[PDB]
Motif scaffolding. Structure first.
Motif, PDB file in Angstrom:
ATOM      1  N   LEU A   1       0.717  -1.194   0.112  1.00  0.00           N
ATOM      2  CA  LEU A   1      -0.195  -0.080   0.092  1.00  0.00           C
ATOM      3  C   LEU A   1       0.760   1.252   0.092  1.00  0.00           C
ATOM      4  CD1 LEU A   1      -2.505  -1.285   2.698  1.00  0.00           C
ATOM      5  CD2 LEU A   1      -2.840  -1.215   0.343  1.00  0.00           C
ATOM      6  N   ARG A   2       0.449   2.320  -0.383  1.00  0.00           N
ATOM      7  CA  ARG A   2       0.978   3.485  -0.772  1.00  0.00           C
ATOM      8  C   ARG A   2       0.125   4.741  -0.008  1.00  0.00           C
ATOM      9  NH1 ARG A   2       4.610   5.310  -5.719  1.00  0.00           N
ATOM     10  NH2 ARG A   2       3.980   7.396  -4.994  1.00  0.00           N
ATOM     11  N   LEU A   3       0.763   5.528   0.776  1.00  0.00           N
ATOM     12  CA  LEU A   3       0.278   6.861   1.607  1.00  0.00           C
ATOM     13  C   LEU A   3       0.505   7.872   0.757  1.00  0.00           C
ATOM     14  CD1 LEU A   3      -1.229   7.990   3.422  1.00  0.00           C
ATOM     15  CD2 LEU A   3       0.641   8.151   5.051  1.00  0.00           C
ATOM     16  N   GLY A   4      -0.241   8.266  -0.573  1.00  0.00           N
ATOM     17  CA  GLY A   4       0.346   9.479  -1.289  1.00  0.00           C
ATOM     18  C   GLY A   4      -0.928  10.548  -1.742  1.00  0.00           C
ATOM     19  N   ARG A   5      -0.555  11.464  -2.481  1.00  0.00           N
ATOM     20  CA  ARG A   5      -1.349  12.266  -2.974  1.00  0.00           C
ATOM     21  C   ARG A   5      -1.832  12.135  -4.287  1.00  0.00           C
ATOM     22  NH1 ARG A   5       1.224  18.130  -0.943  1.00  0.00           N
ATOM     23  NH2 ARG A   5       1.018  17.873   1.305  1.00  0.00           N
TER      24      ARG A   5
END
Lengths: 150, 150, 150, 150
Positions: C146-150
């Protein structure tokens, strides 16, 4: 890889009993030697096999199927039987003994399996001259190897 | 009523370990007397309490809250503590010991709890003169009653 | 090797709920499309994270420690967080989703985790501009990325 | 009495899945009406019964024995069948639905059982004119009462 395998091995037993069984194993190790614990767990395995009999079989594959059918109803791994010349080699995978009693106790906890198959063979007409013995050759964590021989 | 309570008591332990723990209890009863089993399970409970320490408390209710907080993370029932004059009475409900080792073995398996609370009291500044003992007065199946006294 | 990993992945969920959850997943797949199931499981993960809040952290390692402390009380694997330049990558190991809902349903069941971490980040002061999204680049069975990004 | 029964009912499901299934039930309730959830769980029950067929029976006691034999391998309570004049009444005890999805959701989770027995009767030669319906007359928490009627 290694961490995932370690997590799967350590967490196979549920949260309800992991700590309690670890404490029981610690107390057993404090009071008794590994050989006495092996005898105790072998008798426990014999009783377990008596309470859960296997269906009558005639061939090696049928015996393996019956044993795996008993195992699969309790989430206790599976057994593969190979007929090398005259002796049967039983490889058990995914035994939850390590998750319960700890890895360092596998020197005796594995004897439980040695107590089960023995009795099961006694139920399948195996001669009394044959006994099941654990061979200390491979890694206990990966699989438990037993030999049915004289 | 009775059948539903019996089913809940007998199935508290998971299917993965019910038969194995029953066989282990059978072997333990075959080899050792109930008093030796009580000593073994008390030491096991002491080890379990050492591995799962309780938070510091000062009042009776805080001690109850800490013990129940430890219990609730492993699905092991709950404890109610009452201060009768000078002695503390601890009533434990929903211990999964009966589901694992059988009802007839509760004469010694309950000693496990006697081993836990003792050590927990030792962690909360209880005087060494005080000990936890099981009172054989009420029905073991309904609840387990212990006394912290001199 | 492969068979042992497959057995560990398939039997992580208990015998009590494996069949029931498989049937529920089958009914859900028959009734709803994968995207709707992803939305449903994301909202479920948000509710789960709301019911199990994480302790306040300041660094990446502390955040990972809090998340793993929440996970380890329910036997749901563990998460590793890596700070690559500007974005956080979360790799989750040993999620019991495959054992319950089946491997072929991991295309949507994994969204559950996407619902959890998101809410957890909202509890730790993460900007509302940042969102958690599942990257379909690696094998879902081995780990969930998973990626926590904009 | 009451607290013990409540604890047994609320802790039937393991720690691994209680919170996850509660969150999933919350999401399902937020998205769908109770009737839609009843339909979904009825189809899930039909699929579960398809995956676990019952042995051929001829009498009422034999059918009850087969259904209970299927149930006892997954720790899902037990069923009692009574033949009142022309209709069969099935009382199910110790369904772990309440522990998983919450008591307040038993208005629809119980439909799962309605989906199972139906299909099971379809496997035993029951006429297609007969259907299984839940009777909202008794306490759902104590037991689930179902009627096989026209």
């Amino acid at each position: 890889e290694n961490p995932l395998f370690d997590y799967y091995r350590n967490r196979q037993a549920p949260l309800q009993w992991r700590g309690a069984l670890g404490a029981l194993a610690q107390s057993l190790t404090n009071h008794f030697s590994p050989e006495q614990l092996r005898t105790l767990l072998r008798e426990a395995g014999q009783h377990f096999a008596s309470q859960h009999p296997v269906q009558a079989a005639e061939t090696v594959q049928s015996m393996q199927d019956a044993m795996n059918g008993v195992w699969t109803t309790q989430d206790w791994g599976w057994v593969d039987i190979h007929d090398l010349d005259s002796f049967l080699t039983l490889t058990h995978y995914a035994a939850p003994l390590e998750s319960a009693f700890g890895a360092q106790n596998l020197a005796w906890s594995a004897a439980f399996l040695e107590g089960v198959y023995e009795q099961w063979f006694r139920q399948l007409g195996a001669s009394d001259a044959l006994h099941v013995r654990q061979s200390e050759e491979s890694d206990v964590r990966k699989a438990i190897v037993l030999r049915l021989g004289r």
